[PDB]
Sequence to fold (796 residues):
Amino acid sequence: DFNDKILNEPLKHSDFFNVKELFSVRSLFDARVHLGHKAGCRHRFMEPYIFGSRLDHDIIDLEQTATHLQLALNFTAHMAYRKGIILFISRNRQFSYLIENMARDCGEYAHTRYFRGGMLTNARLLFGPTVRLPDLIIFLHTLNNIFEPHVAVRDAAKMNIPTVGIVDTNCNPCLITYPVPGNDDSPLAVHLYCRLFQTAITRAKEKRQQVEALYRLQ
Amino acid sequence: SFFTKLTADELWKGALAETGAGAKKGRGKRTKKKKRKDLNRGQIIGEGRYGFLWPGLNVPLMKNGAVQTIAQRSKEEQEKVEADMIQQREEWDRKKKMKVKRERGWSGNSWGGISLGPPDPGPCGETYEDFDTRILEVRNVFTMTAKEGRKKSIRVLVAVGNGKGAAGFSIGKATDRMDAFRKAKNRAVHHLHYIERYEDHTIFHDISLRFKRTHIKMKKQPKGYGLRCHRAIITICRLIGIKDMYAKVSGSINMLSLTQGLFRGLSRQETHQQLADKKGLHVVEIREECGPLPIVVASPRGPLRKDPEPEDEVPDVKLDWEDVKTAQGMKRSVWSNLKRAAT
Amino acid sequence: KNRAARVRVSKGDKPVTYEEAHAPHYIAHRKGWLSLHTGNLDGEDHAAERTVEDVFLRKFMWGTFPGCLADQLVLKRRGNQLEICAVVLRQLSPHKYYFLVGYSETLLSYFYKCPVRLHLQTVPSKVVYKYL
Amino acid sequence: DEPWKYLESEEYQERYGSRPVWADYRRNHKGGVPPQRTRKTCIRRNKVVGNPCPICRDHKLHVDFRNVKLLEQFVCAHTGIIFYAPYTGVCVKQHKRLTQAIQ
RNA sequence: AUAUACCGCCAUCUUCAGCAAACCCUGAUGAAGGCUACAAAGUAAGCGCAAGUACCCACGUAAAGACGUUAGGUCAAGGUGUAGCC
Ligand SMILES: [Mg+2]
Ligand SMILES: [Mg+2]
Ligand SMILES: [Mg+2]
Ligand SMILES: [Mg+2]
Ligand SMILES: [Mg+2]
Ligand SMILES: [Mg+2]
Ligand SMILES: [Zn+2]
Ligand SMILES: [Zn+2]
Fold:
């Protein structure tokens, strides 16, 4: 029962892994996360996340941005502390190298290449009878190159897999569980997201290890 | 001659003629079918017309610690053994050809009220004993091709349920009937809809909806009312776990659209606790068996609202002239209230 | 489309043996001859007798070890002495096997006025080459 | 046995279980809705007819006023109104006898 | 007598390259469909093609040439289902 005790202890505490210290609206505005596509590229479900429009362009609400980002980071860190498998997706070729490298650095895995049909739904037939499909998915780019929702959000919502995607003005945050409005296209924003996620998951991991070592001592 | 004779498998093939034009094209034949038989399994190799007693194969080699010797089976016991073998073959043929009794569902030669048993166990290990299956509809779909012409494909629709508020429908297509059944069964056990219910035997409130030109109006009813609905609806309700309600289908009739709309409605119905948390008032039920007594159903989990709902006078509400007629009593129809079977 | 000593393709639930899966144009290329004699070579004779007798022997052995064999026979005639090789299943008893072995051996010897011997290899279940 | 100990007996439990008796019976009839009037009786001149009702096929059962836990299963525990013969599947003669017994 | 019961044996498109058990997905869970590589749902057992083998080579020629169509031919190579002479 002590295992369940340890699993439940972080729950009652809010910001228990201290994720809020990482991000600040200063940093977001510096990295140009507040940007958005034109009104022609605007999306209905993204309306409420738009702070306003200026010069046929869109601007994101940074309070909501920071709220959703705090929630996403807390969720990712809780799942890493629970050893829940994580998987990154970014179909954008502009950052595949960086994403794969940071995935290696974290220990968590990624898939930026072409997504094959029924990779997760028929994963048992593809890989083997027993395979632990990932417990958490994240998206640095929700839409594909030709700009329609990647198959991963759909199949994840199907198989009850949680999703954390950064949504630009073109993206549809309906299926996403923890959508973070932001700038999918800017390299500063990409690097910021990668640094935040790697720091958070590494903190969760090391906290798990030190706590379990303390309990082994006790 | 002995050389002209030949073995059994090709002989049975040529005698039965499963191939050829008969089987191809789906023409078949007029209900004549020779059933395969195996003669080698029946009689043991030892016996023949002249019954030499064989210590090697027919009789045990040793008796009383003494080697045996070849002997003759006289004609009396020879005829005895022959009659025994005749009786044994007759019993085998009887046991082979008998009745087949699949429980009568909606009607004979119909795959409606039949259950296929629980779904198959999963690869990782998932016991689905709780689930019961039913076949709602099956049809012979035909699509044409250049060389073979018409290509038949069995299409089937199935439903599965616990009896505990969780159920799901599915569709399967295959050239083989059993294969389509299996595919749809697996698809259903994978695709599940959950729906809440008021007191384990009813929906929360009346649901009227349309779906692909198929209108459905399902009406809540109290205990001991029975299930007076479409037969598919009765099967689905039996799967789900609700024991009594009413329903009327209007417009088109197509069981798959009917089922999809039914599940949409039973999923979109609102619970009383959720409704209380939404509105901010206490629910109050009044019965006919119980006198003027307010039975609290559910209260808002959040803070109660200070003001009550204003009485809605002459409300703008759309309803059905059919229900108006049934309430006013001027309606006449022999087909409305019948003494039908149990549910 | 030719039909000759080849099995029709099914959905994939037909166990088939090596030779029964292979076609009759793989005889010398990816198979061996079940019988071995010299009547087929040039200059010799009695080949018709060899063929008729080996067919008779195959039928007789199939019917005197019925339900236990799971493959075709192998015939090996070295000069005078004749040798047979079979593959069988362990269904019946060794008593049965040895008794019918001696029986058929004596029958062949007295019929052909020739020294005859036979060997048989047991298998738990028929060896399958492929699922057709 | 004329008394009701056949019900307490275990053969009743295994032959039926906890469900009622009528739940097992089913009627063979014309298409769609069945007729509104059941058969007159299941036995005639000590001759049984095909597909008889359960109380008539189980000759050990006895329609009696005193077998309360027996005959309570037709009338609904939720509603005092008896089920009708087209509902419970039994023939009209035994249904009338059961009405007299329950009254 | 029945090739319009068949096996066995073959012509045919074939001087083709498709046929596909078993899964997933789209179409509101309809018959049906599943292609974009600087990639958008297809994955694939197996058969066949192909490859390899034969003749003088790695080319060429043979051989092979699946699923199906012509109720294609063949109860007269042989046997056999049904119906007949017995
Ligand atoms: Mg009938
Ligand atoms: Mg040819
Ligand atoms: Mg023909
Ligand atoms: Mg050729
Ligand atoms: Mg080739
Ligand atoms: Mg013809
Ligand atoms: Zn963008
Ligand atoms: Zn009766």
